[PDB]
Design a protein around this ligand. Structure first.
Ligand code: 5BW
Ligand code: ZN
Length: 110
């Protein structure tokens, strides 16, 4: 019920495609490179999180409110903006996914 509405919102943010390109913005954010693939990420970033983890925290009842879900999504995006350079595509995708989240959330809340 809360779990299922959290699921719906995340599935739709994951599925979201850029208008002109049709590119699925979430794609790089689904799953972080492993600690051995990219140790720099884990040195720089304090609370690593990817969409796979967010889906696990949902399934495991770790979010008490839609606000707690939003907080972890906004953190994934913040972490992307810290690791990647301003002016990079990945950085900007994380920026855009902030408003995709809030839009999807609103629609679903209604
Ligand atoms: O910043 C994120 C990922 C950046 N990576 C993905 C590609 C582009 C950049 C460097 N990449 C590498 C680097 C080494 C191995 C695999 N991918 C990121 C991914 C999931 C959740 C949050 C994130 O910040
Ligand atoms: Zn519960």
């Amino acid at each position: 019920n809360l779990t299922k509405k959290m699921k719906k919102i995340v599935d739709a943010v994951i599925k979201y495609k850029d208008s002109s390109s049709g590119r699925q913005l979430s794609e790089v954010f689904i799953q972080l490179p492993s600690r051995k693939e990219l140790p720099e990420y884990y040195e720089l970033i304090r609370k690593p999180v990817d969409f796979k983890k967010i889906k696990e925290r949902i399934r495991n009842h770790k979010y008490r409110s839609l606000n707690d879900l939003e907080k972890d999504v906004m953190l994934l995006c913040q972490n992307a903006q810290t690791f990647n350079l301003e002016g990079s595509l990945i950085y900007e995708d994380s920026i855009v996914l902030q408003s995709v989240f809030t839009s999807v959330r609103q629609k679903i809340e209604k």
